[PDB]
Every structure is written in structure tokens, then in C-alpha cells.
From a paper:
The generalized picornavirus capsid is built from 60 copies of each of four structural proteins (VP1 to VP4), which are produced by cleavage of a single polyprotein by viral proteases (for a review, see reference 16). VP1 to VP3 each comprise an eight-stranded beta sandwich and form the three quasi-equivalent conformers required to build a capsid with a pseudo-T=3 surface lattice. Using cryo-electron microscopy (cryo-EM) and single particle image processing, we have determined the structure of native ERAV virions, together with the structure of a massively expanded, empty ERAV particle with large pores through the capsid layer.
The expanded structure thus illustrates both the limits of structural plasticity in such capsids and a plausible route by which genomic RNA might exit. However, the expanded state is clearly built from pentamers of the viral coat proteins, and a reasonable fit of the atomic coordinates could only be achieved as 12 isolated pentameric units. The rotation and translation of the pentameric capsomeres required to form this particle from the native state is enormous, with the points of the pentons moving by as much as ∼60 Å in three dimensions. The new interface that holds the expanded particle together is obviously much smaller than in the intact particle. The core of the interaction appears to be predominantly hydrophobic in nature, with the strongest density for interpenton contacts in the expanded EM map corresponding to the location of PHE118 in VP2. The pores in the expanded capsid are the obvious route by which RNA could leave. They are located at the icosahedral 3-fold axes, and are essentially triangular, with an edge of ∼75 Å and an in-circle diameter of ∼45 Å, easily enough to allow even base-paired regions of the RNA (with a diameter of 18 to 24 Å) to leave.
Author numbering:
A (entry chain CD), B (entry chain CA): 1 to 226
C (entry chain BA): 31 to 230
D (entry chain AD), E (entry chain AA): 1 to 246
Amino acid sequence: APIRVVSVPESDSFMSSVPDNSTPLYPKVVVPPRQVPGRFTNFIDVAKQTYSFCSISGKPYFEVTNTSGDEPLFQMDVSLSAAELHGTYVASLSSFFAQYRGSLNFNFIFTGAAATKAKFLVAFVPPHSAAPKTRDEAMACIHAVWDVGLNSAFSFNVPYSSPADFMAVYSAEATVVNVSGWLQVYALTALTSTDIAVNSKGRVLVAVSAGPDFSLRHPVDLPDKQ
Amino acid sequence: APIRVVSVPESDSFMSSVPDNSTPLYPKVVVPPRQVPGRFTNFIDVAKQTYSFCSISGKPYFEVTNTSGDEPLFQMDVSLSAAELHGTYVASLSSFFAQYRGSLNFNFIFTGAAATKAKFLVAFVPPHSAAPKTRDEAMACIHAVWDVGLNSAFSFNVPYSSPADFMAVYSAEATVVNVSGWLQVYALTALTSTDIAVNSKGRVLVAVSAGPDFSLRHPVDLPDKQ
Amino acid sequence: GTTYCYSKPDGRPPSTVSDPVTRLGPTLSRHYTFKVGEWPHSQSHGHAWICPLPSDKLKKMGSFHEVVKAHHLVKNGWDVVVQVNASFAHSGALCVAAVPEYEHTHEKALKWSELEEPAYTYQQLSVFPHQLLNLRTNSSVHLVMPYIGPGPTTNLTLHNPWTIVILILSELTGPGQTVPVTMSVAPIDAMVNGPLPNPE
Amino acid sequence: VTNVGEDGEPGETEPRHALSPVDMHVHTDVSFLLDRFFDVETLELSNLTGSPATHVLDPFGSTAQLAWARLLNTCTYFFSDLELSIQFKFTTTPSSVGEGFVWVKWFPVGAPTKTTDAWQLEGGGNSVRIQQLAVAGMSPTVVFKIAGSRSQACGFSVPYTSMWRVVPVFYNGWGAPTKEKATYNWLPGAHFGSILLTSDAHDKGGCYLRYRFPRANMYCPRPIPPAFTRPADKTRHKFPTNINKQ
Amino acid sequence: VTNVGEDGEPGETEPRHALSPVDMHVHTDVSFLLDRFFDVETLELSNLTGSPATHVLDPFGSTAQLAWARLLNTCTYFFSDLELSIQFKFTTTPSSVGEGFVWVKWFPVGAPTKTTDAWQLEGGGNSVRIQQLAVAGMSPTVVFKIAGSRSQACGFSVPYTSMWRVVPVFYNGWGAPTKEKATYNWLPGAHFGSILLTSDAHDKGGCYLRYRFPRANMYCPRPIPPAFTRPADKTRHKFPTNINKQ
């Protein structure tokens, strides 16, 4: 009658994430009904239905002035480890995982006065020797022309382009699964105003959301701070 | 309620090839679709649908010259441990196993010029006191006459003839399950050419495939090199 | 005779690019013709001309070259015909194979070169999609290869999945002159991604 | 404006083809993430004798640079059950302990807590005394020996015992009528109860408390704090990793 | 020509009757062959303290004169899951260790890796410190004691975590935009992750890593390297064996 059993070598070990529960010692507790609004079941949903502001030089926006042209106003490399993605929800949620997949949605909100106007060219530049320095260079790439004064807000989707099905959350010296290129914003025209003495500059807030195809996998433990 | 169990003596041991899995600690990972061409599921299929070249004196072929006759041009004992089967896929795959069963298919490809011609007699000689030295001796055995200039390539099947259902992959001093005989190729006629100064010799490439009834069993670990 | 390497080509776009994919039609990714080299009597069995596709000759692929040059990723197969120009008094034989992820090349990476294969390799090169080029029977080899790689597409600047190996199995004998090895390459079902900046 | 691609008109954007699923968002699932053992806390054993204090199981207001700490701070209200793993690691010579029983007692939210040694065991002259609240009874008592133990641990599941329908991880108000700086982000009973580890070892070693949160429910998402510093403008953080260029 | 037998005409071959099946080619099955434990690697334990480095699980480019080494080199692309057996064998006196806990941490492909001792356990004066990344949490931590242990081992299954749909065993190109001799047959993440073995033993002994590859899939066969030297022309290799003439 006693059952012949063979003890596996990994026998008395711990294994932290076993797919099984411990023995219960305090049964039959019926818990009170928890009505309470706003329950969420998956972090990816709040990442997709919500936006955070980027950290451009410590502020949540870049500026256009009545003197601008050529040079890029905003530039960030496409990696969740990028600096301008620092204080964001999507970037911060990501540190819990090893890999990501999908697009990021950026939306720019021009907060310059109603008496103010400017036009922007926003480009997604794929991995390359070295990042364009002027807009005539970048305009060969995927880009959109944002004329404020048509819509004060503009959404741009940074796509996912890679031979790998997922890329790394934690970047490092450039690898083929580390970085996906750059996102740049140029001034197609400098800020014009009704009176340059009253309005000389206007600020574009830049916010990020997880794209519809965005996903995160492989939960990871936090490494030494840096 | 606690179940009466009896611990077997082989209890806390290792046993490397147990037919069972270990406990999973990192669940629910859905893996990306792996399209990719050319998947193979059994090594015997690639051994049968593919050919390798033999190693006759370090070259993948034997030669006929305008001076040949009698003596064997190619001779190899039927054993996967044979020398001329050395660099082949079938021989190399075999070292992973202890026993084999079935036939080997050899095909000779005459690469002498189109202005060249010769005839070969290929014989399968069963285990015997000592291997024939001339073709008039071997021709009493199973043999085929290959007239190049009829077909430039010729396939010959070395059969499986033994009282045992399988023979040894790893040969040694001759035993009843070690060796199955010899495969020999003779020149029925010497190489003839349109001009002996231009073409004096022609090379026959010899390739091996696993036969249709070929099989390998008993995976084995690699012993000390030799 | 046409040999398909592993499978026939497909025109399916890469599963891993959410950005616009451009399908290059046949008249855009055309076809290019090269002389691989000359097979001499002195060269011995095991010697091979290694032709990764394309990477050292991309600059000579006119139209295809211009388009590929301006984009980041490319998915595409190839249609190659290797030929040999020999008389009916020449003896010898080659094995021309299409190898996925070929490597040896001592990092003369992605450059068409010549090397000496190591025996177990020349003996077993037939294990890869290939065709024998026996000088007494034929003069051509025709191989068609599908896109292949660890991911759904690549960057041809950093990776050449397919590389054509033309290997000497039986040395050249017969008339003293050499036998030129020739090759036509045509990109097939080419798809291109993400345009790069202007070259200023 | 215009919407989709290649005319380059103002407001017009180019075509994007969304990617197909693969992983199914399984890993970003709240209850999946929390149903695993986390090494939160490490704690000292109390001597069998005296008047020890119970340790409250409250993993909520943490600052620890660990994944459970931030994660538990991502919502405003939380509900889950609990599982524990208690281990014991020597800090002296393992041969100091020849028996080493450890009494563990778990207390539901709201349980009375004053204990003093009161239960005497007698044997051949010498005697042993254990706490009033270490004895096996109404609430769970677990007893494990550390000596020859192949794992010097114990473990069990316990339910949500709070009186609140949900635990406020953040509370804009006071948990007591007297509004003392103390009772500020407070609310009594916003936890899992308390435990009492008691043993003749006490010196000789410590514990290792791991929590597992089965059946987790989170309410009202909140901002998630950074974890790393901000790299320089227009750069990327570069971390050591599995992948990395050799 | 003529085909089948006994007239001896040019091109004619004699009759052969193929053999009946018996073994059914079960043993030459790719996934059958790989689903067993292989002793690949042997490795040293790191001390609990300091800043240890993780060991990457990459059995792919091996030269080892072992059956798994060549076998894994028989295809161009590979996919499989993984199982591990970690054992621990003393290299000193077994009585040196009175407790000997060993913390094992496994990391999925792409995981961050910088660790320094940071979790303190306290007990009776003396204290013990373990790595930031050895603690139980997000990824699996296994803890086994070596002391009285009847097998001084542990073991568990882990899945394919790479981002590549398939692992390239051979890669004609570079894994990084900078084309350094280093990143040549490379490609980041073409592996099973990494582990971190950490313990107060560390000196005193080493490990023994065995891999098992359930659900293996191989793509594009490649040449199989010889294993033994070439015997003399027209001879046979002669090896010691079970069979052999006494």
C-alpha cells in the first residue's frame, strides 16, 4: 500500500516563481465587496490610454523662436533608454521588462499664443552613420509637415523597424537590437507673431503614449542604480 | 489524510536521461512565429536525400589512366569505420550511434572529358579469406559493368548481408558483426582519348548516400579521440 | 535544370516592420552579369571561389543598388546562373552550392574571394542546396534562393544570408587554357524599408 | 488633415501597418506580475523569553530599490492575498545549533499583541519557556527545526484580513481623530497582519521574508518613479546586459 | 540501362530486396536526441560579496570533443527550450561547509546585469550580505543548501527568451553597426539567457551545468565534422568496444 516514490535531486530547494501555491492556514475568510472605480488589470492598457510628457532638457517641451531654421529643435534616439523619454510612464513601466515591441505615439501640442504661428517638419530617421544636421537632409526620410494654425496638436507615430521581433529595453553601446534610429523635429519656419516684442517664442509640449501594437515581455529585477 | 509513501532506494540520484521534465519557473512565454525554410526533423532523412564525396587517398575520386587493367582502382572495406568513408555525412552522422542496418548507395561520376572513354567493373565482394587482387577473380561476385559513354554517372548499391539484424558502427579486429566485405572498382578497359597527350587520365568522383533501408540506432557518447 | 534552395521565394512583407514597405518590381531590381574568375590547371581540389550575395558587388548592381542604398532594410531572394566556358576536351568538375550563413572568410567579410576549403567541407558541401558542374556533361548551374535569415528581413550592409560557393572537386586537365567561371545574379521579390537621409 | 501618405501635404502623415501580436500582453498583467515570491524584508528572531514585539506585514510605503517596492506604489488602492516563505540563514557557526526550533505565529489584522513567556515545558530538571502568543491555537503557529534541515525554512498561505474593502496605498487624511503628524498617510489596518518569530537561536542568525501576492487587484493608476538618473540631453542610458557587444 | 539483373549487360545491376524496418528511425529524431541532460560546462561559484559577472548560457559555438557540441553545429538555425541541472562537487573537505546555501538566479535574454551586495540579513551581531540580483523576485531565484544534501543540486525548466525567432548557429555578418572583429559571427541575444551562482562556499567547490533541450527544431543541415582522424588507405579504424574479440 505505501506508494513507491523517487525524490528528484532538486528536492528540498526554493525556486521563487514556482507555478503553485503554499498550504493555507487561515481558511474561510469572506472578503467585503470592493466596489471602488478605476480598477486596471494590465499595465499595457494604462500605458496606451494615457500620455506623459517628455523631458527635453528638463522641461516638458521644446521652443521655437523668431530665429530658427535649419538645425533640429528636438532630437532623441529611438530607445526606451533615451533621455527625453526619462520621466515618462511608458519608459518607467519598461524598466520592469527586458524586451519591447511596437510603436510609440508622440503628440506635440503648440502652446504659443493664438496670435502666434509656425510650421514644423517631424522626421523618423532610421539607423545610420550619423543623424542629419539640417532639415533638407532629413526630409528625404519619413516625415510630416505640421502647420500649426491648421491643428494646434499633431500626432506622429514612430514605427517599429527591425529584423528582430523585439528589441531591448535596456540599451548600451549600439547593437542591432539596441536602437531603432532617431526622432527629430525641425522648424519649417520660425515663429511669426503679431508683435515680436510681446510673443517672441512659443513652446511645443511633447507627450508619448504606447502605440496600438506596443508590448512588453520578460519581467526583470532592478539592477544597481545608475 | 497524509498519504503513505515508501521512498525507493535509488531515491535522491541523478539519472541523466529520465523521460520527464523539470519544474518550470518562467511561465507563459509565447514565442515568435518561426517561418524559416529547410527545417529537418530526422537526421536519417538528410543522410538519405544527400550525398558526400569519399576520401580516396585524400581526394574525392579515383583515376583511370591509359595504362590500367587488372588491379583494383578503388577498394574499401564495408564498414562505416572505413577510411574512404571518412569525410562523409553518413560516416560522420554514424559516430553518434552504436549500430546501423541497411544499404549504402555509391555513385560514381566520370569527369573525364567528352573526348575520353573507359569501362569499369564494380564488385561487391562478401567477407572472405582475403580480397581479390585482379578483376577476373572478383567478377565471380555481384558486379555491374559501367560503360561510360552510355551514362557518365553510375549508381551501385552495397547490400546488407549478415546473420545479425544490425552491425557495428565502430569496427575493430574483424568480428562477425564488424565488417560486411569489400567494395572494389576495376578498369575493364584503360582510358582511351582522342589525343593521349591532351587527355591521359580521367577522374571518377565517388559519392555515398544512405540507402532506402538504412538506419541507425543507439545514441552513444564520444570516446577518446584517435 | 532549376534547383530551389530550401523553398520557393515569397513576396510576403516582413512581419517586423510597421513602416511602409516598397516592392521593387522586376524592371527595377533587374539582373546583373559578372565574371567570377578563371579556373586554372594549377588550382587543386578544395579550392573555392566564395561569392557572398552581394556585398562586394552591390556597387555594380545598378538600379537595385541605387534603391537598396537609400533604405535601411531589405528582404529578397536571388536567381543565379553560374556558367563555365570550356571545350569538349577539358576534364574537371565543380560543385556550386548556395550556403545560408556561410562563414570561414577570416572576416574578409562580404567580399568575393578564394579560399581552400577544409576537406570535410568540400566532401560534404553537397549537403547544402547545390548542383554539380561536370565538364563532360554540362556547362551551367541554376539556383533560385528564397530570403533566409534569423529575422524576417536584414540590412545587407551588415549581413549576407546567401553566399555562393563554387568549389573544385576534380581538377582541370586537358587543353592548357583556363576555364572562365561566369555568373548572372538577379534580385527576386525585393522589398525595401525605411528611407535614409539625403547624402549632404 | 488629408491623413494617409505620400503627398506630403500639411497635416498628412504616411502609412503605418500595425504589427501582429506574438506575446499577447500576458506579462504586463497585474496579477501575474505579483504572484511570485519577492525577497522584501529580512528580520531578526526574538528570544523565547521576554516580552517581544510583533512585526507588521506592510510592504506598502517602500523606497527599496527593488521591483516589488515600486509596483506596489503604482496604484492608489490594493487588494490581494498573501503567501510567505521564511528562511533562516546563519550568521555564525552552523554547529552552534543542535536543535533550533523556531516558532512562527501569524496574527490577522486587529489581533491583540502583548506576550510574555508563559508556557513551561519540563524535562529532567531543566525547563523551557515559550511565549503566551507563540503557542499553537486560534491563529496559525508553525514550528520548524533548523538543524539538519535541508532548507532551513517554512511557508504557508494566509488571506486578506483587513477590515477595509481595499488597502489605501496613499491616504490624504488621518487615521485617528487627533491629527498627529504620525497618523497622517495612515489608516489603521491597511496591511496583512503581523508575525512573531521566536527561538533559542535568535543570535546565531536571521530570517529572509518573501511575500507572494495571489489574487492581486489594483485600482487607480499612479505615476511610476524613474529608477535611474537622467542621461545627458540627446543621449541614451547604456547598461551592462546579456546582449552587449563583447 | 537494362536495370535489373543477371544478364551482365552494360549498365545493368543485379536485384536487391530492401530490408524491413525494425527500429523505425526513432533514434535519429532531432528532438529525441536533444531532450536529455548533457554535461556541457563546469563553473565556479561567486562569493556572496562584491560585483560578480553573470555567466551566459550559450552552448552554440563549441569545440568540445563531446556529443552535444557537434550536433548543435549540424544546423544553421536552432530553436529549443531549456532545462538545467546544477550540481556542486567539493574540491576540498566536505566538512568545511556547515550550511552552504547557494543562490542561483536565472536571467531572460536581455536582462540588466550590474550587481553589488546590497541585501543585509542581521542576526546576533554578525550579518550576511547578498547581491542586489540574487534576491528572489521578478526572475527565478533558486536556493539550495549543500550540507547533508543527498544530491548537492537543483534543477528547473526555463523557456526560449531570445528576441530572434530562431538562433543563428552561424551568422555571415555583424551583430553591431561598428564592424569590429568581435561582433563578426555574432548577433546579440542568440542564447538562453544567463545565470548567477553565488555562495559562501565559492572556494570549497564548483558546479557542473547540464542542459536539456526540449522542443528542439533544427533548420538547414550543415556538414558534420569527422571526430576521429583518417585511418590509412584501404583500412578501417579499429576502436575499443563492448563487442571486441576477447
